[PDB]
């Protein structure tokens, strides 16, 4: 099984078809399988079909260009629980998407996804990358080690050493002749 | 045409080739040795020569000044206007 | 000396006999292989393809 | 080549006929139909002077006249216009033969050469032994 | 949630060393599969001529549609009766222009018609460049093998005229030394 | 069908798909073309062991 | 709605050679280079190189990936345990030289 904090993503029947924008990165990402089907945004998709606080000035900046996400924070401020919320922007090609949970407005953030090229990556904690860079170090470095004490022999006559595999007149006669 | 020719003649597309997928003529080999026994003949011909040292045996890409008994050292020039090494 | 050292240079940076007649050979070689109308099919069938529109920006 | 910088010349001069358009729909005025009717507008039209509003109009037909002159040229000077394909065919045989032909004229050129060569390395090898036997 | 790409043809478990080797002894004796070497022989060309690849269709040998297979309006159909007729559509597409321009003047509603025929009359136009382009690869063609003509003959040029700098000077050093004889 | 083209494959463009062997070394001058002899010979081969007789009596098979 | 057949089939594999982010993700899969199968196939879909098959490559430097890595499988050697031997730096050639080859065909695209 692959877990899901370690796989690329993106839908390019959903490219061809629909084409990725800034107006369309939080429903391209609703079918990634880092969306969840019990959140906020899909149930206010469901229920559309049938000055302010509580955020940072990089929010702020997304909410006043785009109107929609305006349009999404007002509806989600009458719910509370797990949402997805679009948080920075580079046009034409890079998002963020954070999972957020808001209680009344009091909101803690959970795990983030970003958007490069609308092949969507799940934000790894630090820790999993540096620990599996980590891990390969230290295989390599293992590796290393054995295959260089095959290459060791110990005598007692010596040290330990290393295994052994199985003229001097020139510049006297340059310095007499010249 | 061109991709057109590329892949009608060789079944490829001419692309640059890092790995497996050159051969040097050894009549050209021939050739060019001659020739370089004539660059060190047309060489020799334009500089003196030492009256111990006129003992030249001229084959083989190279010149073979020899002292009899002594020595025999072989030298070969590149083109006309280099020094001989 | 110099005067003939300079023309047979001048006439040996000429290409070789053998490096001729293996371009005749090679030339040779193509009409086996190359046939006219099927080129022309496979050239307009990879024309849409192997380079870029040159309408586009 | 010449097809191709036609269908650029047909793609540009629609594309002519798109700004012409463009321009004569959003850089126009307004006029008096009679003296007494008010006349005002706005700061959301593009008022400009109807000289050089005349005169913008004059060198964008001029425009499309000159694109229609390079597009009537090169269809003039497409290349091949009154030989069919028999006749291409016709040409195609007797320049592979004569390709063959001057292919070896070259092979009897490069053995005129080879002659060349051969005579002259004798020449000068000749002289380079006599004249070193001769310093000698 | 699945993989990016799709994996490779399940043929390839059919090549192994045992097919191979029992394969020149097969070959000495829409297919009708008969056995398991019958996937190790390369497949026959499409008996209907059209193959499907990618999500299109394509044919062995393709030919140019014609606008009434796909469904336009072809005003007219040994080219100069082409040429004079991408004049002559040319000349027709500066007339509908200069109308359209004088509809929209006078009754921007009719413009459908207008903007339809400019439309048919582009695409007649595109679809003569079209029928052009197989004439124009073949002079392109024609033009290959006459450019390497001249490079073949340039060559010839070159190495004759190096021999006969080689004949002049060798008469050069025949003249002088006749002069110091 | 058709009729055969013959062709010289090592220019196509306008003003090397098949590698020629003579036009590739013999046109370059010798200074840097006697490395790549002598590695084409051998591997640690020297200057000093070519021989025409070698030679002669190599090309003959 | 037919079902597909082993022309079409070999064709689309064939040209998917062309994309060489696939051939990446086919060979940084452990099965498929230890495996001789692929290395049997690949050998066999040489009769591509030869018309009337390549007339309808659409995508021929998929051809010359064919022959690029139809060079290694010569120097192949099956075991007797199936590994496939001489192939570990196959993937680290391509993984190496893939944004390279396609930057240089992309090149000839232009």
Not at chain 1, 115 to 138: D, E
Request: hydrophobic share 35%; net charge negative; aromatic share 10%.
């Amino acid at each position: 099984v692959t877990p899901l904090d370690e796989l690329q993503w993106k839908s390019p029947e959903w490219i061809q078809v629909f084409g990725l924008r800034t107006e369309n990165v939080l429903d391209y990402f609703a079918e990634s399988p880092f969306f969840d089907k019990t959140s906020n945004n899909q149930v206010i998709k469901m229920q559309r079909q049938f000055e302010f606080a509580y955020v940072d000035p990089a929010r702020r900046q997304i909410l006043f260009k785009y109107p929609m996400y305006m349009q999404l924070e007002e509806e989600l401020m009458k719910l509370d629980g797990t949402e997805y919320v679009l948080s920075s922007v580079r046009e034409p090609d890079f998002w963020v998407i954070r999972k957020q949970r808001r209680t009344n407005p009091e909101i803690i953030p959970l795990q983030d996804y970003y958007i490069i090229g609308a092949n969507i990556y799940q934000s790894p904690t630090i820790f999993k990358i540096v620990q599996s860079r980590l891990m390969s170090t230290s295989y390599h470095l293992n590796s290393t080690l054995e295959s260089l004490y095959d290459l060791i022999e110990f005598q007692p006559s010596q040290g330990v050493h290393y295994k052994v595999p199985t003229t001097e007149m020139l510049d006297k006669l340059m310095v007499t002749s010249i | 045409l061109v991709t057109a020719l590329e892949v009608l003649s060789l079944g490829r597309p001419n692309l640059p080739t890092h790995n497996f997928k050159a051969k040097v003529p050894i009549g050209l080999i021939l050739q060019r040795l001659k020739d370089l026994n004539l660059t060190v003949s047309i060489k020799i011909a334009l500089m003196n020569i030492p009256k111990p040292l006129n003992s030249y045996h001229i084959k083989n890409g190279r010149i073979y000044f020899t002292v009899p008994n002594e020595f025999e050292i072989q030298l070969s020039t590149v083109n006309r206007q280099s020094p001989l090494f | 000396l110099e005067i003939l050292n300079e023309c047979h240079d001048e006439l040996k940076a000429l290409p070789m006999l053998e490096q001729v007649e293996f371009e005749k050979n090679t030339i040779l070689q193509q009409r086996s292989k190359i046939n006219s109308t099927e080129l022309l099919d496979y050239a307009t069938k990879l024309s849409k393809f192997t380079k870029i529109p040159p309408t586009f920006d | 080549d010449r097809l191709t910088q036609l269908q650029i010349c047909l793609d540009q001069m629609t594309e002519q006929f798109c700004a012409t358009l463009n321009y004569i729909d959003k850089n126009h005025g307004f006029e008096r139909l009679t003296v007494n009717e008010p006349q005002m507008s706005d700061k959301h039209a593009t008022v400009v002077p109807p000289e050089e509003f005349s005169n913008t109009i004059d060198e964008l037909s001029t425009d499309i006249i000159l694109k229609t002159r390079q597009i009537n040229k090169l269809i003039d000077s497409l290349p091949g216009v009154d030989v069919s394909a028999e006749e291409q065919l016709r040409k195609i045989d007797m320049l592979q033969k004569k390709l063959v032909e001057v292919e070896d004229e070259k092979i009897e050129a490069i053995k005129k050469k080879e002659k060349l060569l051969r005579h002259v390395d004798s020449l000068i090898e000749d002289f380079v032994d006599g004249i070193a036997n001769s310093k000698k | 949630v699945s993989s990016l790409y799709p994996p490779p043809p399940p043929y390839v478990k059919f090549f192994t060393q045992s097919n191979l080797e029992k394969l020149p002894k097969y070959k000495e004796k829409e297919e009708e599969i008969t056995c398991a070497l019958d996937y190790l022989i390369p497949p026959p060309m499409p008996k209907n001529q059209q193959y499907r690849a990618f999500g299109s269709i394509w044919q062995v040998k393709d030919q140019l549609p014609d606008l009434e297979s796909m469904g336009l309006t072809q005003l007219y159909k040994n080219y100069q009766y082409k040429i004079q007729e991408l004049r002559k559509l040319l000349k027709s597409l500066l007339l509908n222009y200069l109308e359209l321009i004088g509809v929209l003047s006078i009754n921007p509603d009719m413009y459908e018609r207008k903007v339809e025929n400019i439309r048919t009359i582009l695409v007649n136009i595109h679809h003569l460049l079209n029928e052009y382009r197989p004439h124009q690869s073949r002079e392109s063609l024609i033009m290959l093998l006459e450019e390497q003509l001249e490079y073949k003959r340039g060559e010839i040029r070159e190495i004759e005229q190096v021999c006969k700098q080689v004949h002049d000077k060798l008469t050069s050093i025949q003249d002088t030394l006749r002069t110091g004889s | 069908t058709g009729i055969k083209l013959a062709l010289d494959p090592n220019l196509i463009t306008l003003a090397s798909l098949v590698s020629n062997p003579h036009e590739i070394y013999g046109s370059m001058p010798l200074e840097q073309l006697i490395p790549i002899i002598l590695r084409q010979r051998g591997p640690g081969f020297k200057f000093v062991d070519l021989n025409e007789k070698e030679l002669q009596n190599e090309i003959k098979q | 709605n037919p079902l597909p057949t082993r022309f079409e089939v070999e064709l689309e594999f064939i040209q998917s050679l062309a994309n060489i982010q696939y051939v990446t993700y086919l060979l940084t899969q452990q099965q498929i280079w230890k495996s001789p199968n692929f290395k049997n196939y690949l050998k066999y879909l040489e009769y591509w190189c030869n018309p009337p098959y390549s007339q309808c490559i659409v995508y021929p430097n998929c051809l010359f990936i064919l022959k690029l890595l139809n060079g290694f499988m010569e120097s192949a050697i099956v075991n007797e345990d199936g590994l496939l031997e001489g192939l570990d730096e196959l993937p680290k050639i391509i993984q190496l030289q893939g944004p390279q080859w396609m930057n240089e065909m992309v090149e000839r695209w232009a």
